[PDB]
Amino acid sequence: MGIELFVKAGIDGESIGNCPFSQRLFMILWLKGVVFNVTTVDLKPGTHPPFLTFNGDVKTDVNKIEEFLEETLTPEKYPKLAAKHRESNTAGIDIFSKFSAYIKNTKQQNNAALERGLTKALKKLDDYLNTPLPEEIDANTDKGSRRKFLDGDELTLADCNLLPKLHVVKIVAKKYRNYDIPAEMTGLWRYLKNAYARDEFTNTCAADSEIELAYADVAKRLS
């Protein structure tokens, strides 16, 4: 029967829509190397996408699905995707909610404090990406880390979670608040540059226009 992934449809009805949970499961299956089909849904159960077919059995809930896929598609045929360092699994965890509060606020009074909160949370992630892992420390003779992703030089489940959310942040905060992720965060930008160079991330992103239009009614203008 196989594996079929159902993701959110875009505004046009056909394209992949804005949904970080959809992109997360899409990336996991891609990175596992398993054979699968991906399909868009509009739901007009009730079941909200994403969800997946596994030999005909319906699996819902993104968090349970990740665990099922990581523990079912195992070595030796499939790569283990779990991060090795526990800290990779929480880095940048609060960014998406600090971004959500920043763009939904209507009061000009609170904008500065909300902007700082998003920036501070982004900075804590930048600090994690710059702190050398212990395997990095054992290979010189702290000079700053040069690893590509959260957990080291290969993509993990932690990246499949963070990267779609970071993509929404970057595009929406720029479009609706003219916010730029600060250039001085060299660690975080190295990470995004390495991710965007990977098909598994870039080719599972929704289009810029689609993401921006998806927030037309969620992002608010300041009073």
UniProtKB/Swiss-Prot annotation:
GO terms for cellular component: actin cytoskeleton; apical plasma membrane; cell cortex; centrosome; chloride channel complex; extracellular exosome; Golgi apparatus; mitochondrion. Keywords: Cell membrane, Cell projection, Chloride, Chloride channel, Cytoplasm, Cytoskeleton, Deafness, Golgi apparatus, Hearing, Ion channel, Ion transport, Membrane, Mitochondrion, Non-syndromic deafness, Oxidoreductase, Sensory transduction, Transmembrane, Transmembrane helix, Transport, Vision, Voltage-gated channel. It comes from the Eukaryota. The keyword Aminoacyl-tRNA synthetase does not apply. One of its GO terms (biological process) is visual perception. The chain crosses the membrane at residues 21-41. Inhibited by F-actin. A motif (G-site) lies at residues 19-22. Its EC number is 1.8.-.-. It is an enzyme of class 1 (oxidoreductase). Residues 78-215 form the GST C-terminal domain. One of its GO terms (molecular function) is chloride channel activity. Widely expressed in both fetal and adult human tissues. Isoform 1 is expressed in renal glomeruli endothelial cells and podocytes (at protein level). Component of a multimeric complex consisting of several cytoskeletal proteins, including actin, ezrin, alpha-actinin, gelsolin, and IQGAP1. Interacts with AKAP9. Interacts with TPRN. TPRN, CLIC5 and PTPQR form concentric rings at the base of stereocilia and may form a complex. Interacts with EZR, MYO6 and RDX; the proteins may work together as a complex to stabilize linkages between the plasma membrane and subjacent actin cytoskeleton at the stereocilium base. It is linked to Deafness, autosomal recessive, 103: A form of sensorineural deafness with onset in early childhood. Hearing impairment progresses from mild to severe or even profound before the second decade, and is accompanied by vestibular areflexia. The active G-site contains a monothiol Cys-X-X-Ser motif which mediates glutathione-dependent redox catalysis. In the soluble state, catalyzes glutaredoxin-like thiol disulfide exchange reactions with reduced glutathione as electron donor. Can insert into membranes and form non-selective ion channels almost equally permeable to Na(+), K(+) and Cl(-). Required for normal hearing. It is necessary for the formation of stereocilia in the inner ear and normal development of the organ of Corti. May play a role in the regulation of transepithelial ion absorption and secretion. Is required for the development and/or maintenance of the proper glomerular endothelial cell and podocyte architecture. Belongs to the chloride channel CLIC family. This is Chloride intracellular channel protein 5.
